[PDB]
From a paper:
The capsular polysaccharides (CPSs) surrounding the A. baumannii cells are the primary receptors for bacteriophages encoding specific structural depolymerases that determine the initial step of phage–host interaction. The genomes of Friunaviruses encode only one tailspike depolymerase (TSD) specific to a certain K type or several K types with similar structures or linkages between K units. In the obtained trimeric structures of the TSDs APK09_gp48, APK14_gp49, and [name]_gp47, each chain contains a particle-binding N-terminal domain and a central β-helix domain, as well as a C-terminal domain forming CPS-recognizing/degrading parts. All depolymerases studied were specific glycosidases that cleaved the corresponding CPSs by the hydrolytic mechanism with the production of monomers or/and oligomers (dimers and trimers) of the repeating K units.
In the case of [name]_gp47, the protein includes a part of N-terminal particle-binding domain (residues 154–213), which has three antiparallel β-strands, the following N-terminal helix-turn-helix domain (214–252), a large central right-handed β-helix domain (253–661) having 15 rungs, as well as a C-terminal seven-stranded β-sandwich domain (662–785). Rungs 7–9 (numbering starts from N-terminus) of the β-helix domain are complete rungs and are formed by three β-strands B1, B2, and B3, separated by turns T1, T2, and T3, where B1, B3, and T3 are solvent-exposed, and T2 faces the three-fold symmetry axis of the trimer. Besides β-sheet hydrogen bonding, the β-helix domain is additionally fastened by 18 salt bridges and hydrophobic interactions between inward-facing stacks of side chains of valine, leucine, isoleucine, and phenylalanine. Noteworthy, none of the pairs of stacked cysteines C348, C381, C413, and C434 form disulfide bonds, in spite of their location proximity. [name]_gp47 crystallographic trimer has a diameter of 75Å and a length of about 150Å (without N-terminal particle-binding domain). Each subunit of the trimer has an interface area of about 4928Å2 (16% of the total subunit area). The trimer is stabilized by a total of 201 hydrogen bonds, 27 salt bridges and hydrophobic interactions, mainly between the β-helix domains of three subunits (formed by the side chains of L226, F253, I259, V279, I591, I614, I621, I643, and V650) and between the β-sandwich domain of three subunits (formed by the side chains of I689, I708, L722, L724, I728, V741, I746, and V748). The trimer has two cavities—a small one in the N-terminal domain and a large protruding cavity in the central β-helix domains, which, however, lack solvent molecules. CPS-recognizing/degrading part of [name]_gp47 has no homologs among phage proteins deposited in GenBank but shares amino acid similarity with hypothetical protein (WP_228157370) encoded in A. baumannii genome. Treatment of the CPS with depolymerase [name]_gp47 resulted only in monomer of the K unit.
Author numbering:
A (entry chain A), B (entry chain A), C (entry chain A): 154 to 785
The structure:
């Protein structure tokens, strides 16, 4: 008929005997004296439907095959995580169990009710696996900061690939009060050591304002960590939503780190796009768009942002040392910063030896009237170096305020001192109001002064200013009434090309030079009478002389002749006459000197001394007569 | 005997009853009243050889295990793609079905008959999987551009790993005509948004010349895309084959992109190695070898190539704005460019505010005679900055033409204006023929002039030129006949070390300086009679004076004494005598002046004025006699 | 009863007949005339427990499923490698068999007895798989260098992910003798071509000192290779152990390479952290800590280290060309170097055209007295460019020796020539003792001289030195006795701000300038009698004059008047009187000159010539009397 036998209570089964369970599944006896009921007791029985009873061609059991094949890539889904379900339990189970672990892929979205703690020395792979926050993640009251994925106090994690985080702030907005609120990061690692945190793409955080001891957290946050690496791509939803209160703060946030590397992209942040604070940290090509805070904040010590790509702030592109204890050798190493309401780069008073190199434009985008805040580079601090490249027309934005603005308020404990300035660009001013400032500039097309040095520039060296088709190359405008204000200020080489107004100086420099023979060759071919080959001209602004002629004194290398077949010197002097400075010359000539009269109708003379130290003039009579010594 | 039962037409099968199919496979009844013929009708039957009827140790079915294990890594080969077969159908099936997808490995080579379209938001992994083009890929007539893998109009692709492409142009060379041809890219993405395209290694393309509206495509091509990233390593087979016609064009081609990043390696390209055009695009360390076109072409706006590694072109290393509408702030940010037939870097007339920093050598490798094309840096455009580092001996190549060549043809709407030049190196010239040029140079070992400023240099500032063991530091050689030509040209500090010939100037600069006390200390220890401590010397090139002495006038700080126990001034004058300029001195001395005669046998004198403005000389008689006023 | 039938010797089995083996496993006949004993002979029998006799829902066999699922990710463990066992055989088996191959994960540690040779064109993936050396790896006598993983003479490897290596030197320390020892690298590739070697984390090597022809190997070593890429993170255990002899040498070692890229991290190395030698090689952000050798050694040709991060050496941060044939255009492209016993950067005599740009501090940390070795930058070679940024206070370390020290020992075949120096920083000296040196400096807070130029500076141009609150801006201190020593040395613009002592010069420069009108405008408002508007002052150091007044000669632009309502010139002369230089003036004035007496009680005069060339003085009598010509 058919094959069917149940267990018989009275029978002894030999080895290899097959029967059925009440379920229908077939059992074989492994023993010769089998009396055991396989429905109750599998002692000396095997189920023939077992994986361990299927054989591959190789000689491996199917069991052996499933075991080795699984152990290659242990997944969250192996632990019964479900995409579009709460997977919390399953996730934590997976982590606790598996040193190497696969999250899943781009089609996976695991819902998480509790903070996911990574484990020490583990390796995690991820193909685009998303994690989504749900209620309860904020954890226990007195609320302390949490994340979806956490590596707080973890050592030697590796993450290979892409992890995605989703926080909807609208779920959490009703929780806490005035004093205490949830803080929910995408990723947090506080006190992590030597971790590669792979790649993140994260939307949203939860960081509503609470009144005492408010702590901002990033979407992606690494705090108090050592030798950690992450890549992160965050969206803060600023300008993509309307919200009652400020939901989220900083995009990507690094704070009190040592030796930590970011590859960083931030948008739509209600505070700072990227903040990176600490010691020997690196921001590698940060890319920031449309942030309510500053695009990029650096502090700490020897923290460098390389090849920046910043656009669109309610504040500035770059703060150095904003709200910070320390900003020592915090550097920006090339890039582009555009469309800031205030400054491209604000180097705060805290800054020590910060180096900024930047292409920058469309600062001072504020509706608000011009201030120190509306600068390209706004510089305070101690011995900062600016390498400015700028253009005012760039990206069809209209600037407000100086290209560079370096300034103290007082010479007594100055807020800005020892700054080095290197500035090239088109169509705004460099303003300096700070001691010991070293200035190099190339400026094209400024309406006004290329460069001004105002008050409080004591001991500034202006090495070189080249100005093409400006209002004025340089003006020095010190505090006249105070010797201290302009003491030791050196204006070096000023280069004027088709500037409207001459440069304006103050003070007299002391210069020490090597002995020279200076040789001026004139190629020209032809020289008319009293033609200047080479001159130095000294002009006065004396009270006593009001009226257009102000030549005080001059030395002129002259063509003496209507042929240029003789040459001399013009030793120029001056005296007040008819409310003007009248000029006259001692003429140094081949075989003669000639002293010219002070004015028409005055005689000229030679003053000599007797041995008794009385003084005598030889002065012509208007006749061909004996010369006599006339007392003077 | 044995176990064998077929279906019986007359029998009712109880639950758990096992029989055989005619095939021999065993069936169990799931029902108590089974009358159904399992050969025809599996209603209430199960095949006992099913995966769903094998149980792992865990409690999972084998079916459940195969389902979860597959869904980890869905592959092309799961969809019945075969390596070394046409896999087109299978591929497209795989893509349509699977959000996450594995290509395969280095031993996989899938043959593709039709363009492979990726899908939006998908994640693709690849371990070296190769795709090979076959006939039909060119698609339908009127031929439009195709690729092996395509992401035209795709959003949010991720590619993890390495994809390899093979196009043999020899399959496609007979297709189209004069007017219409196939275009076959390795990879194309036209109008892609926010895609990471991982890593490519691609050989060959199909892009034969057709007569109207010819469109070049890359081996690897990203057109009209936003926020896309690729790495690509291409071979164009130029110099590895002989071909009737030009088969392929550009290696890696980026055109009208916004915010797109390349890591790029190109060789053996019949056009450009790498071209990258657009807005805010980045070329990160492009590595180009042996290209018939230019090694690297930049255009658009704020497109930067970082840390270039270019060698071996029939054209140049770098074109900026070749055949382009726009080349505004298109920058090269360090690297090395060598072995160009023409220029290392050609900044075309289109260029606005382009910055080039480069080590460069072995330009002008052409057999053809020296031209503007045979330059290190060939610069036209508006306000480009050159940072040149060069060496003519470098890599044992022999250069032709100037190190830097900045030039307009006319001052009226000049093709080059406002260029900034910073040049250091060994053993070639800097030539400037352009207005408003700012020059800084350090040149060693040039045969001729370190620097020349030719015609059309109006309003150029030459800040500093240091020349070691050149022919000449600087020559200024303007259009003499035109005041406009040399108007406002400033030659600053020229530094001559063991140059053969003195520097040659033209024009006279107007300089405004801060008031100085200048203090020249001479350490020497010993000074002979008429020894010059410090001098200024003015020389003439007057027509009227032909014959070697051309000192017009001088001021000399002099040791007056054969002991150096007295010091004075020499006020030097000159007059034509015996077809030479004869020199004579007013001697300013402690307690005297001394006017020397113009020539031997002439008397000296003092000219003074009477109050009636007649002039009188005191002139010695050759006796110890009364001095009289003598009319003059 | 039950289901059980053995093979019967007398029976013919029809097709589909099932019996048992003596083992109990069920067999079905595939043939109608089966007479074959399945216990001895499986001809026309199948085992029903076969994978090929289980069917997935899809229609695939379980066999077909195991085959395709395995071939996705072939592993070492598939080949029966065991973690914490000797896996050598299994590994080599895996490699020989599989073009694509998975090592395993972070929980895998395979013990290796013999060098593992990779294969040409293969692709390897690794999730943190560790390999550990055991005895026998050193291989056969005469000992030749070995590694755990080897790619010597391999082409076109790819490695994706992270491989980890462990060498315990304590296993191998008893082997060889005086002449011959094991050399055991983590990874070695000698003569590899176009390989991506992914990522390494490696501890330890074996490289004990043997007396003739000692060859240092890296922990991670690439020798004589072309177009190879690696990332490597090594620990040499220096300072983590005590050892009898030097066990290991170089961390990461690149030697005679062409076009090879490193991402490099080294610590605790008994020699060099990272060495990279060859042609067109790149060290991308090398990160070195706590090394007994130099942190970083470059040689060869066009080898560049970018954005260095070096701290803590018994030697220096950077050697260029240490123990090398060639060091031509070997560059350091930004970064930070700190805490070297000797120099931050030593550019050896071999160096040609090396460019160094660096922030540097805490050099000369040695207990040993100041030498040339205790410099920030120690520079020898031919035409090296230094861009120095320095700070002596930085990181609370106390420096010893010059910031920069550029030096030859002789002008005859000089060890240092043609060096370019650009130096900014705080609180140490720049020393130059080398010909043709170009100097630019900005120095703050040096105790002594900002800059000194010593002996052997022939044909040096010091373009600009800015000194703020130094001891002295510049001193030039040549070999006085030798004209050659200071020939052609140009000291340009020296800027002194509140320096203690004036700059000290030697020699007189020849300067060629463009013709100028120089216009000095004085803004001041008020001028007293004999007030200097602008002056040049020439001072002597003559033997003959000992005693404080050393003004030799001067030209002074003067306010002539107690109102500043007249202006002139002061032409200053001097003569020895009462063991001082006494000053006197020719006064150039509006309508007069005035010659002042040499000293009180001397008369002044005018010297003129007769036509017979005899000389005559007009000199006052002390009366209102006839002027006579007095012979002189």
């Amino acid at each position: 008929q058919y094959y069917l036998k149940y267990f018989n209570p009275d029978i002894v089964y030999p080895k290899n005997a097959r029967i059925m369970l009440d379920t229908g599944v077939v059992v074989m006896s492994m023993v010769d004296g089998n009396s055991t009921n396989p429905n109750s007791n599998m002692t000396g029985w095997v189920r023939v439907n077992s994986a361990s009873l299927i054989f591959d061609q190789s000689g491996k059991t199917q069991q052996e095959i499933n075991d080795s094949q699984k152990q290659k890539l242990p997944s969250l889904k192996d632990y019964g995580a479900v995409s579009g379900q709460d997977s919390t339990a399953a996730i934590k189970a997976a982590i606790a169990a598996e040193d190497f672990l696969y999250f899943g892929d781009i089609g996976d979205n695991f819902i998480v009710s509790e903070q996911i703690d990574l484990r020490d020395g583990c390796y995690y792979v991820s193909n685009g696996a998303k994690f989504t926050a749900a209620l309860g993640i904020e954890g226990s009251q007195p609320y302390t900061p949490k994340s979806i994925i956490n590596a707080s106090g973890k050592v030697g994690i590796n993450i290979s690939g892409l992890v995605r985080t989703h926080i909807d702030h609208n779920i959490f907005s009703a929780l806490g009060d005035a004093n205490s609120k949830p803080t929910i990061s995408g990723f947090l690692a506080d006190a992590a050591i030597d971790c590669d945190f792979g790649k993140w793409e994260s939307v949203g955080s939860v960081n509503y304002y609470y009144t005492p001891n408010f702590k901002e957290y990033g979407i992606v946050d690494l705090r108090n960590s050592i030798d950690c690496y992450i890549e992160a791509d965050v969206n803060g939803r600023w300008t993509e939503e309307t919200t009652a209160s400020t939901p989220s703060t900083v995009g990507i946030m690094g704070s009190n780190n040592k030796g930590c590397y970011l590859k960083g992209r931030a948008k739509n942040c209600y505070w700072s796009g990227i903040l990176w604070e600490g010691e020997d940290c690196v921001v590698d090509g940060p890319h920031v768009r449309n942030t309510k805070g500053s695009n990029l904040n650096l502090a700490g010590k020897n923290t460098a942002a390389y090849n920046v790509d910043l656009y669109g702030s309610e504040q500035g592109n770059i703060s150095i040392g904003e709200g910070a204890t320390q900003a020592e050798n915090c550097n920006v190493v090339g890039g582009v910063a555009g469309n800031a309401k205030f400054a491209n780069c604000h180097l705060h008073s805290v800054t020590k030896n910060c180096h900024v190199k930047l292409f920058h434009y469309g600062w001072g985008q504020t509706a608000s009237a011009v201030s120190d805040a509306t600068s390209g580079i706004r510089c305070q601090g101690t011995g900062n170096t600016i390498d400015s490249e700028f253009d005012v027309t760039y990206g069809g934005l209209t600037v407000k305020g100086d290209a560079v603005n370096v300034y103290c308020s007082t010479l007594t404990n100055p807020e800005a001192t020892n700054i080095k300035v290197n500035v090239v660009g088109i169509g705004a001013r460099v303003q300096i109001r700070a001691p010991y400032t070293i200035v190099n500039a190339k400026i094209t097309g400024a309406t006004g002064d290329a460069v001004v040095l105002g008050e409080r520039c004591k001991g500034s060296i202006v090495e070189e200013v080249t100005a093409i088709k400006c209002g004025r190359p340089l003006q020095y405008a010190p505090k006249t009434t105070d010797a201290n204000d302009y003491a030791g200020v050196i204006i070096g080489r000023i280069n004027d090309v088709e500037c409207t107004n001459r440069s304006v100086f103050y003070g007299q420099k002391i210069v020490h030079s090597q002995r020279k023979i200076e040789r001026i060759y004139a190629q020209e071919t032809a020289f008319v009478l009293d033609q200047v080959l080479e001159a130095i001209e000294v002009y006065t602004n004396d009270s006593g002389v009001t009226g257009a002629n102000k030549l005080a004194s001059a030395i002129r290398h002259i063509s003496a002749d209507s042929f240029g077949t003789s040459y001399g010197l013009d030793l120029v002097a001056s005296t007040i006459s008819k409310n003007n400075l009248a000029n006259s010359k001692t003429k140094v000539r081949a075989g003669h000197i000639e002293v010219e009269p002070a004015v028409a109708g005055a005689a000229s003379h030679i003053v000599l001394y007797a041995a008794n130290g009385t003084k005598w003039k030889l002065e012509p009579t208007g006749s061909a007569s004996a010369a006599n010594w006339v007392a003077v």
